[PDB]
Amino acid sequence: MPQDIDFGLPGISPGLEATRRHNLGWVRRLGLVGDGPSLAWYTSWDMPRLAACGFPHARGAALDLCADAMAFFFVFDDQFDGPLGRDPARAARVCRRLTGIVHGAGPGPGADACSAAFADVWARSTDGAHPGWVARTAHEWEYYFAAQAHEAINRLRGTPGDMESYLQVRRGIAGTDLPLSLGERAAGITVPAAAFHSPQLRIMREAAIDVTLMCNDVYSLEKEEARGDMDNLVLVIEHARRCTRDEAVTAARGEVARRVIRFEQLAREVPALCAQLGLSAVERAHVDTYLGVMEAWMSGYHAWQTQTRRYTGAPHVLPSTGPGYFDEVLPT
Ligand SMILES: CC[N+](CC)(CC)Cc1ccccc1
Numbered sequence: 001m002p003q004d005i006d007f008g009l010p011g012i013s014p015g016l017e018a019t020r021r022h023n024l025g026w027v028r029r030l031g032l033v034g035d036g037p038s039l040a041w042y043t044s045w046d047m048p049r050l051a052a053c054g055f056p057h058a059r060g061a062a063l064d065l066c067a068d069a070m071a072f073f074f075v076f077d078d079q080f081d082g083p084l085g086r087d088p089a090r091a092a093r094v095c096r097r098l099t100g101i102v103h104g105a106g107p108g109p110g111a112d113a114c115s116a117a118f119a120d121v122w123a124r125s126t127d128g129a130h131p132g133w134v135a136r137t138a139h140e141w142e143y144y145f146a147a148q149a150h151e152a153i154n155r156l157r158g159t160p161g162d163m164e165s166y167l168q169v170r171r172g173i174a175g176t177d178l179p180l181s182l183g184e185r186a187a188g189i190t191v192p193a194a195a196f197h198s199p200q201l202r203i204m205r206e207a208a209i210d211v212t213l214m215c216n217d218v219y220s221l222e223k224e225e226a227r228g229d230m231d232n233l234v235l236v237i238e239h240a241r242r243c244t245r246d247e248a249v250t251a252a253r254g255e256v257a258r259r260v261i262r263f264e265q266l267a268r269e270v271p272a273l274c275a276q277l278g279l280s281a282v283e284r285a286h287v288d289t290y291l292g293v294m295e296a297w298m299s300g301y302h303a304w305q306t307q308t309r310r311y312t313g314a315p316h317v318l319p320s321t322g323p324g325y326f327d328e329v330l331p332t
């Protein structure tokens with residue numbers, strides 16, 4: 001059981017309570033969350049604590065954006081736990097609508113709640129951001145939206161992919177590097193490109209994102225398996241290795257542990273790398289904060305998922321015999 005699994009990872013943002021108030025008003029104003037069942041269900045996820053634990057460097061309005069972005073991810077995600085997630089062409093068309101917002105085509109007044117919420121998050125994200133950050137993060141959003149239809153293809157196939165194909169789909173649908181781009185933005189830093197593209201930081205970024213989605217795969221397996229989801233590390237290992245469920249969970253834990261070890265080995269090289277690049281003291285401080293942002297995403301996501309009611313509650317309040325939401329908020 002998830003309660004008997006810990007992964008071996010290493011504060012919390014002071015704005016948690018203020019962000020809880022803002023975010024509750026925001027999801028209602030945008031129409032992303034309604035009244036009654038959806039609202040109590042949304043509240044039980046505790047999106048503010050995810051923001052405050054996953055992005056502890058964020059303060060004030062920056063933490064508000066983190067929580068609102070998380071709200072969009074989770075509400076949008078669940079819209080595919082139903083007929084949409086078994087209809088790849090329809091999923092691709094819906095996600096093309098969202099992608100158009102990324103690249104400039106504003107949704108306009110009266111658009112659906114998911115389009116309006118995304119447009120608000122994206123506008124707030126890019127306001128005052130460095131153009132290199134905007135370009136990279138725009139392509140990250142594109143991958144996230146485009147990957148959803150491939151998860152639907154895999155559901156229809158009914159077998160897990162091999163490891164390489166699992167990673168290609170799962171890294172996309174998990175939000176790719178978007179949590180780290182968000183944490184960088186919310187911390188108010190800009191990583192110098194020379195450091196960002198070092199082999200060390202590129203490997204570390206990929207490792208941190210893998211760690212969180214794999215930790216999620218383990219804890220979210222119960223609600224996903226009954227829905228015919230196929231892009232879950234435990235199912236991929238079990239199918240590839242012809243092993244028991246316990247053997248597959250053990251191997252999944254090992255995939256997380258080796259990535260944490262790699263991350264921490266490379267982190268020790270970062271001061272020396274900054275010196276070899278001749279970065280300024282301010283730049284080195286921003287790189288140090290970027291390291292903390294990655295570390296806190298890994299440790300803080302796990303801290304959140306052990307206390308949330310999303311994964312223990314989903315099989316009971318939204319059983320697999322019906323859709324995985326109370327209200328359709330995404331027109332298809
Ligand atoms: C990033 C939020 N997400 C993915 C889009 C919403 C369902 C859950 C998640 C969190 C952390 C790792 C992997 C997935």
Ligand SMILES: [Mg+2]
Nearest residue numbers: 077078173174
């Ligand atoms: Mg998903």
Ligand SMILES: [Mg+2]
Nearest residue numbers: 077078081220
């Ligand atoms: Mg999901």
Ligand SMILES: [Mg+2]
Nearest residue numbers: 216217220224
């Ligand atoms: Mg999951």
